[PDB]
Design a protein around this ligand. Sequence first.
Ligand SMILES: Oc1c(Cl)c(Cl)c(Cl)c2c1[nH]c1c(Cl)cc(Cl)cc12
Ligand SMILES: [Mg+2]
Length: 691
Amino acid sequence: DPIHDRTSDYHKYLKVKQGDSDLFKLTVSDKRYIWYNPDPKERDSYECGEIVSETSDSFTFKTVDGQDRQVKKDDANQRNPIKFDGVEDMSELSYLNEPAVFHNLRVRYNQDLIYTYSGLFLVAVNPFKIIPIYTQEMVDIFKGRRRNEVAPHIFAISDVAYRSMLDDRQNQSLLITGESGAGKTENTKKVIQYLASVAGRGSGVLEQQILQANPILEAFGNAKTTRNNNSSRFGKFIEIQFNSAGFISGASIQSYLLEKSRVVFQSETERNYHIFYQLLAGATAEEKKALHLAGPESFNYLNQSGCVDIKGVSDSEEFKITRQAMDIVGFSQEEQMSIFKIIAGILHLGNIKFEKGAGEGAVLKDKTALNAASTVFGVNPSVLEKALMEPRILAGRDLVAQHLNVEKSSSSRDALVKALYGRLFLWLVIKINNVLCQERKAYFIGVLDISGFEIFKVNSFEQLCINYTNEKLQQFFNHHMFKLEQEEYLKEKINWTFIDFGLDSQATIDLIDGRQPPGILALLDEQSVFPNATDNTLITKLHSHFSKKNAKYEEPRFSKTEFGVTHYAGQVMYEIQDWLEKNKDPLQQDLELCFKDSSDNVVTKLFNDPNIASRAKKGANFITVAAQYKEQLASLMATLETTNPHFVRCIIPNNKQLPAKLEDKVVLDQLRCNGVLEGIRITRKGFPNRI
Ligand SMILES: Oc1c(Cl)c(Cl)c(Cl)c2c1[nH]c1c(Cl)cc(Cl)cc12
Ligand SMILES: [Mg+2]
């Protein structure tokens, strides 16, 4: 039994190292300790001091340097006895304060223990190194075991959730939270790996097909940002489906919010979608030739950033994992060849240079780029040319050929690009989903893997939607841990005095999504379908509704184009440039008409299927991105309320993507805004189990 043997892989990599006889003299000490601040400017930096004496209401302690401080017993962060260092579940701690909790994570982390229970939920501190705790060997260890008999792990939270689907005849969910780069996606993978092995078998084909559905998606929707080298630029809900017996019947992936703008623009040091790089690096010299390929350096979509690679990942190498993934999934070779044609053409569309012509409208002098794109897409180059610079609209009912300038022609090209890619994404997913939903499920476990909370020097509409989602997820923790918990108690009259935990990101949610009084998104919406509206008339309007009126909003004194929202995880400054176009998300109809006549079997499904090419009207208008997303979100929150939720809080150790560097400042922020200590306080003080 490997749980009980001190030499095993399980004991070596998931359990606290046996302390020696020196650490024993110290564990049995009668001395008592306190966590204090050496500089009261820096609240998150802690040193340890011995309590030397005590009055009625206060302790005196030794600082490290020399002196002796006095503070009130009520403002004292006491150090737990050292028998607690490395405890597996922090609800067991005698003292529940900030440095006390951080310290325990510090102890565990220093010997590579990334998982800690914080009562009912799991905490996962990111290692930024490979640690051998996800082998089949390790999966088997966790098969069936109750939570308090095995070490903390993601596999375990996964087992308990599974036991709970079978023992309550009720649907389950794993909500993995975290700012960008904190480890969400990695732990998501692990939930699926574990679920797959434990409840799998036709042969064992479905199982391999679900696992191999994530490298595809990752190639097309992950990219290098300044925060994460493998950042998910789309959100993911995965229902792993189970039969009446409790074996794997299927899986369905729902995606949210592809950052389509990445395809045509990256910030310094960042990358476009991995796929672009994988194609250019990993293709045969024959495949490069029929696609008119070159290196990344000769494409506008791939050479603006200064960076074409990521340290320790070979793009040549990832192209194989990806191709192998579309194989196992049952994408035909006609289908892949088209997929890389769509990807190849986007790059070419990117190389079209537009210049000023005789008058105010645009001409295209060199048609190398245009012709290449038309060639790989299966479309008439002269129809594309005209649809790009001279698209036709209605003026009243009259048909008017417009002649677009350099700025507007470029945007339209970009708009065509973003729609090609976005529709391509939607199609990969519906295809994957079709191979995998093969059975009417009796039960599911749902894994939520969102784009995590992010801030950049320049934060835009995408960031707002990313951060709004991260905010709703946080309130969803708040509702389950604190609001639902206590409204029971008080209803079962079993004698509870109400606690205000002081965690409520409601006023932030409402500022963004409220409809009456109107929130940011509704003011955006109203502005998008008002015809004299500009980015200037939009921010004035936002300032007008919220400056000095909502305690969650700021009009900055320093800029006339940014607004601040104070999120649970910090204040974010949003740039308004381009919001109206990002919300309307317009595409010229002549462009749509150019691509419906594609000789390509895939491109034609992106443009002719109502599934993928349609837009739901709203009276005299199309649905905005904000209203479409606010709704898909609400639709998911409704799916979650109907489940028993399990939470995993992923924690980023630092902001430099480094191993063995736990930055206290960075980790405590996250502990506060996540409500980690409030979650532990609710479990000590209260009564979870109720029959
Ligand atoms: O990526 C996109 C997605 Cl992912 C979706 Cl759902 C739609 Cl409706 C569109 C899109 N891109 C579009 C363009 Cl360029 C035009 C229209 Cl009318 C709809 C879309
Ligand atoms: Mg992710």
